[PDB]
Structures are given as structure tokens and as C-alpha cells.
Amino acid sequence: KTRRAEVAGGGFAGLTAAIALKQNGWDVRLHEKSSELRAFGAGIYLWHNGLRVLEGLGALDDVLQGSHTPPTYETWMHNKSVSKETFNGLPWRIMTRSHLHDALVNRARALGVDISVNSEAVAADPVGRLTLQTGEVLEADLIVGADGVGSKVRDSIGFKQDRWVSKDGLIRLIVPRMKKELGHGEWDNTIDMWNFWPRVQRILYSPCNENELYLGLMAPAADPRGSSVPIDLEVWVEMFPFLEPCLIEAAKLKTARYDKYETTKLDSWTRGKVALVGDAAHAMAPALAQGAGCAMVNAFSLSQDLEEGSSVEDALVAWETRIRPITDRCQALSGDYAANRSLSKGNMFTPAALEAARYDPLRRVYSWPQ
Numbered sequence: 001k002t003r004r005a006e007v008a009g010g011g012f013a014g015l016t017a018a019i020a021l022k023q024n025g026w027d028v029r030l031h032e033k034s035s036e037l038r039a040f041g042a043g044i045y046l047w048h049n050g051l052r053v054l055e056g057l058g059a060l061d062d063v064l065q066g067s068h069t070p071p072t073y074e075t076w077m078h079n080k081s082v083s084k085e086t087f088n089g090l091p092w093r094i095m096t097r098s099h100l101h102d103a104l105v106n107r108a109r110a111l112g113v114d115i116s117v118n119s120e121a122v123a124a125d126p127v128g129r130l131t132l133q134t135g136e137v138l139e140a141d142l143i144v145g146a147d148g149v150g151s152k153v154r155d156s157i158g159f160k161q162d163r164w165v166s167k168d169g170l171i172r173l174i175v176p177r178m179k180k181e182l183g184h185g186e187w188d189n190t191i192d193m194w195n196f197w198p199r200v201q202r203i204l205y206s207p208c209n210e211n212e213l214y215l216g217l218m219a220p221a222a223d224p225r226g227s228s229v230p231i232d233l234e235v236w237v238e239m240f241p242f243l244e245p246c247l248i249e250a251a252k253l254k255t256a257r258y259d260k261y262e263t264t265k266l267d268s269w270t271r272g273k274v275a276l277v278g279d280a281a282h283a284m285a286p287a288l289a290q291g292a293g294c295a296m297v298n299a300f301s302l303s304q305d306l307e308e309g310s311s312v313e314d315a316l317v318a319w320e321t322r323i324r325p326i327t328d329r330c331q332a333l334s335g336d337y338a339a340n341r342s343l344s345k346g347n348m349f350t351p352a353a354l355e356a357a358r359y360d361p362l363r364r365v366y367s368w369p370q
Ligand SMILES: Cc1cc2nc3c(=O)[nH]c(=O)nc-3n(C[C@H](O)[C@H](O)[C@H](O)COP(=O)(O)OP(=O)(O)OC[C@H]3O[C@@H](n4cnc5c(N)ncnc54)[C@H](O)[C@@H]3O)c2cc1C
Pocket: 008, 009, 010, 011, 012, 013, 014, 031, 032, 033, 034, 038, 041, 043, 044, 045, 046, 119, 120, 121, 122, 146, 147, 148, 149, 152, 153, 170, 260, 261, 277, 278, 279, 280, 283, 286, 289, 290, 291, 292, 293, 294, 295
């Protein structure tokens, strides 16, 4: 009677699938390749779609405590404010990655999800097996590929994949807010601080709570000072002097990494009893801040479709058919924004840009109209 799920990946997609399945009475085992459960990338934004998934997972309270909704999302071009957007009340939130990841881990443990670390999936079979790097073959009614970019679960099966890689990247960090030292201004806002002159450098300034500030320092990979890690303090201060107190702190972080990204569009997300979720299926450009939101909605939604009385194989097909278009459209528009630098103009969180954000996975409708 008790159905079994094997999840490869302990990132936001895997943790979400795990919790949602466990809530529905699945016996779920999650496998994380790393030696501990950690999330990288410094900070993250969630919108109403993602926040609803957390509500659905019973992990919302722990996320909202200790994270921040700025009074406004502000854009600057060459230090001039060009927009302030509040999205007609659409909920949104900024936090560190560890904060979101910890809430999800605690919830999974509270539910009794079996979590293994040092446990790497190297292959999956559509008939319902997952092979680990040690050689162990696990049978289950449902295998979830939540193993991120470069997914072995996906590549062991072979999907037709459109791949693209960005040449340019950014350096993401958590630093103290330094609020007093920043002096006059609106330093609780999101501030997307664009510049093309004297050089292409941008900081997305993203308060996570009273103590922690998430910064994303973005410069071309061809720029040997701006792309440097640990950060080349002088070049960031010269273009963002009003952030010097925080940048001095960022310069102390010798763990900084300059990270680029890749995008992935697949011919399908399923094969038999194997479902691909998150980056493994649909890595997208960061411009709409929806990569994880989409992953969380999709993982959540996969549990919904598995409650319909159908075989797993048919429930998977139904799931992709139902939920995929919101992700495809989001991915597409985000890619276009990123290629065209569209957010530089401000006022670009249009109703179509906000489509994925407006989606409520709990009631399966679009809310917070614009
Ligand atoms: C610059 C940038 C900014 C972004 N900002 C946002 C944002 O603000 N808001 C947002 O919603 N999204 C954002 N994203 C997207 C977001 O980072 C990803 O979409 C999301 O983290 C992917 O979740 P995941 O669970 O699919 O994969 P991952 O987070 O990559 O996790 C996969 C996990 O699987 C593990 N793993 C890997 N291989 C194996 C294996 N073989 N076996 C077992 N485990 C394995 C990994 O160790 C990792 O723990 C951003 C992306 C970029 C590039």
C-alpha cells in the first residue's frame, strides 16, 4: 500500500519534493551527494508563488521570521533612480540561501524524511531504480531527479537538451548591513544599481534582515579587476562609493566566487517513473528571480498530480502537461531580459514578467492581479 520515492539532490527542488511527498504519506528517501546539507549562492529572492509553496510545505513561518520584504524594488542607472516597483501588493521576500535551506531541512526532518548525505545518484532507470555511486541499486515507485545542473539522473537516461552558457557572471556575498554607516538614504530597499559608464559594473543590493545584506557584484568576465575574487575593493568603491562600508566588509570574504550560469530546456521532464525537477530540468536566466520559485512550484505540483489515482507514469505526464508552460514562458522572458539588459530600464516587472510570481500552486490559480 505505502508508495516509495527516491529523490536525488538536497537542494530547494529536492527538499520541496521530499516534504510534499512525505506529507501525502509517501515513504521518501533523499540523497545528497555532498557531505553536508548546505546551500550556496549567498542570498535569494522568493515571490508569492514560492511563498505559497512554503505555506503548502508548512515551512513558511520559519522563512518569514528573519527575512525581509523591502518597502520597494528600486532601480538606478548611473546612480539616478529610474523606477520604484511594489507589484500592487504581490508578496515577495529576500533571505539568505542558508535561511531558506535550513527551514526546508528542518521541516523535512520534522516529517521523518530519510536524508542521506555523501550519497550520490549516478544513474536512474525509468522502471523505477536509482543507482548510487557506491553501486547500490534502489527500487522505488517514483524517482525524482532534483540533482541540479549537470544532472546525472537526467544524463543517465538521455533527454534532448537545449543548452546555453553565459560568458558573464557575478560575485554573490552576504555582508553586515552597516546601516548606520550608510548614512542618509533608503537602505531597506532592493536597489538594482546599473552602470555602463565608466565601466560595465552593477550591484544588486538586497537586504535580508536587520543583520545581513545580500550583494551581487556583476562585471564582465573580460574585466580582470571587476570579476576578481576576493573582490578588488578599489574598483567597486570607485563606482559605488555610497556602499563603501559594506564593500570593505565584502573584501574580507576570501571565499567569494565569480559564478556564471547555464540554461536548460528539455524535450520533456519525465521518462516512466522518473521526473526531473528544478535546474536538472529547466535552469534559466536569473533576471526574473524565478529559478528556484519555478523549481519549488514544479516539485510541489508533482506531488499534487500523484494524488489523482493514476499510475505514476501517467501522473508524471499529466504533471508536465499542466505545470510546464508557466516555467517555459518564465524561462523565455527571463532569457530575453538577461540578453537585452531589460531590467536596466526599470519598470520591467510587467504583468507578463510577473506571471510565474502570480501563480498560486495551492489553489492552482493566478492571484495578485496587476
Ligand atoms: C546568479 C543567480 C541568481 C539567482 N537568484 C535566484 C533568486 O533570487 N530567486 C530564485 O528563485 N532563484 C534564483 N536563482 C536560481 C536558483 O539558484 C536555482 O534555480 C535553484 O537553486 C535550483 O534548485 P535545485 O534544487 O534545482 O538545484 P541545486 O540548488 O543545484 O541543488 C541540487 C543539489 O543536488 C546535489 N547533487 C548534485 N548532483 C547530485 C547527485 N548526483 N546525487 C545527489 N545529489 C546531487 C547538489 O549538491 C545540490 O545540493 C538564481 C540563479 C543564479 C545563477
